[PDB]
C-alpha cells in the first residue's frame, strides 16, 4: 500500500476537523507526518479480528469501541470501571502491524494496545514530528476548508 494512499485515509487530513481560531498549517496540529506506521490489526484472546470504530467528523472527541466483522461489540475503553465487561485487559486485546514502520510487530501490553486503538479512531496511524513546529495536537483545516469558508 503506498504511504500516500494510506495518508489520505486519515482524519487529520479531513478539512471538516478544524477550528475557526486554530490558525496556520495542518502541520501545526498533529505535526509534520514522517512515516506510515503500518496497518494496525486488533485481536482478542480468542484470536478474532476486531475493528476500531472510526470517529465521525462531527465529534471533537470519541470513545474507543471495537467490534467483530458483524458489528458486535467485543472490547472498549471503559469510562466507569466498576462494571466494565469489555476492557482490553478482560478481553486480552492485542495489536499487530502490517506494512509501514511497525511491520511484523505485535503489542500485548494493555496501555500500549490502548494507545494504538486511540489513534485508530483517526484511521491509518502515522508518526509525526511535533517538535519542529511546536505542534499542539489539535486538528486544523486545510486550504480546501479555508478557501470554502472565506468564499461562502
Amino acid at each position: 500500500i503506498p504511504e500516500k494512499l494510506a495518508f489520505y485515509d486519515y482524519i487529520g487530513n479531513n478539512p471538516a476537523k478544524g477550528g475557526l481560531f486554530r490558525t496556520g498549517p495542518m502541520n501545526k496540529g498533529d505535526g509534520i507526518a514522517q512515516a506510515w506506521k503500518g496497518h494496525a490489526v486488533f485481536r482478542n484472546k480468542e484470536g478474532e479480528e476486531l475493528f476500531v470504530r472510526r470517529m465521525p467528523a462531527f465529534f471533537e472527541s470519541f470513545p474507543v469501541i471495537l467490534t467483530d466483522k458483524n458489528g458486535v461489540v467485543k472490547a472498549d475503553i471503559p469510562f466507569r470501571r466498576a462494571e466494565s465487561k469489555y476492557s482490553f485487559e478482560q478481553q486480552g486485546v492485542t495489536v499487530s502491524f502490517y506494512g509501514g514502520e511497525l511491520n511484523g510487530q505485535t503489542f500485548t501490553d494493555p496501555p500500549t494496545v490502548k494507545s494504538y486503538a486511540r489513534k485508530a479512531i483517526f484511521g491509518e496511524i502515522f508518526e509525526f514530528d511535533t517538535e519542529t513546529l511546536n505542534s499542539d495536537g489539535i486538528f486544523r483545516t486545510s486550504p480546501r476548508g479555508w478557501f470554502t469558508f472565506a468564499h461562502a
Binding site: 475503553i77 470501571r81 483517526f122 505542534s135 486538528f139
Partner: protein, 244 residues
C-alpha cells in the same frame, strides 16, 4: 445547664472538643483484668503548620504558620475503639470507627493553598509501660493511615480519573502522551502519619481525659499529580474511657 442543638447552632461550639475543669487533676485506675474502650475521642486542631520546601536542600526547612480557609469544619470526633491493657502494663488504643477525617485547606503566605485530609484513620497508639492509672503523666504515641485525599471516583476538570473518567487528554487528540503521563495516569496515595497525645487533665470519677496533641502527616498529592507537603497539626483532645 445542659445545652441543646438550638443553643449551639451557628456558634462554632460544635467544632470544639469538651473541656475539663482545672480541678481535673486525678487518676483513673486501670484494672488489668478489665477490658476497656475509648467511647469518644475528639481532636480539635488549633494550629496547622506546613513545612517550607527550600531550594538549597541543605538548609533546614521549617514549619510555618498557615491561614485556614475552610472554616470551622476541622475537628475529629465521635471516635471509638478498643483500649487494650498490654502484658507490660501499657495501654494501646485501637481506633475502629468515628468521624476520623476532615478535608482541610490552609493557605501559605503568598496564597499557595495546601489541602490535606486531616485524619487518624486506623490509629494505633500506645502509652508507656506500667500504666496502673491514667494520670496527667500519661502519654499516647502512635501511627495512622493517610489515604488519598480524593477517593478513586474523583474526576479532574478534564474528566480524567482512576476508577472512572478518561485515560487521556481528549482535548489534545494528537499530542504525544509521554509528557502528560503524570497528569493522565491517576494514582492513589496511602502513607503513614504519627501522633502524640499529652494528657493534661484527668477526671478519675468519670473516666474523662483531655490534653494537647501534635500530629504529622502528608498533604494532598492530587491523585499523584504533584508532590505532597509535610503538615504538622497541633490542638487539644478529649477522650472518655469506659469499661467495656
Amino acid at each position: 445547664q445542659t445545652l441543646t442543638y438550638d443553643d449551639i447552632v451557628g456558634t462554632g461550639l460544635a467544632n470544639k472538643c469538651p473541656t475539663l475543669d482545672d480541678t481535673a487533676r486525678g487518676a483513673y485506675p486501670i484494672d488489668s483484668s478489665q477490658t476497656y474502650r475509648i467511647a469518644r475521642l475528639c481532636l480539635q486542631p488549633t494550629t496547622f503548620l506546613v513545612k517550607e520546601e527550600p531550594k538549597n536542600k541543605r538548609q533546614e526547612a521549617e514549619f510555618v504558620p498557615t491561614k485556614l480557609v475552610t472554616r470551622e469544619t476541622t475537628s475529629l470526633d465521635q471516635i471509638q475503639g478498643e483500649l487494650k491493657v498490654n502484658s507490660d502494663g501499657s495501654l494501646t488504643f485501637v481506633e475502629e470507627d468515628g468521624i476520623d477525617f476532615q478535608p482541610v485547606t490552609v493557605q501559605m503566605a503568598g496564597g499557595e493553598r495546601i489541602p490535606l485530609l486531616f485524619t487518624v484513620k486506623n490509629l494505633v497508639a500506645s502509652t508507656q509501660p506500667n500504666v496502673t492509672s491514667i494520670t496527667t503523666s500519661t502519654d499516647f504515641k502512635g501511627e495512622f493511615n493517610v489515604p488519598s485525599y480524593r477517593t478513586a471516583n474523583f474526576l479532574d476538570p478534564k474528566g480524567r480519573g482512576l476508577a472512572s473518567g478518561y485515560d487521556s487528554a481528549i482535548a489534545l487528540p494528537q499530542a504525544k502522551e509521554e509528557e502528560l503521563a503524570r497528569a493522565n495516569v491517576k494514582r492513589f496515595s496511602l502513607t503513614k502519619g504519627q501522633i502524640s497525645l499529652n494528657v493534661a487533665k484527668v477526671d478519675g470519677r468519670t473516666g474523662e481525659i483531655a490534653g494537647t496533641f501534635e500530629s504529622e502527616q502528608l498533604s494532598d498529592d492530587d491523585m499523584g499529580a504533584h508532590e505532597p507537603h509535610e503538615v504538622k497539626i497541633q490542638g487539644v483532645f478529649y477522650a472518655s474511657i469506659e469499661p467495656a
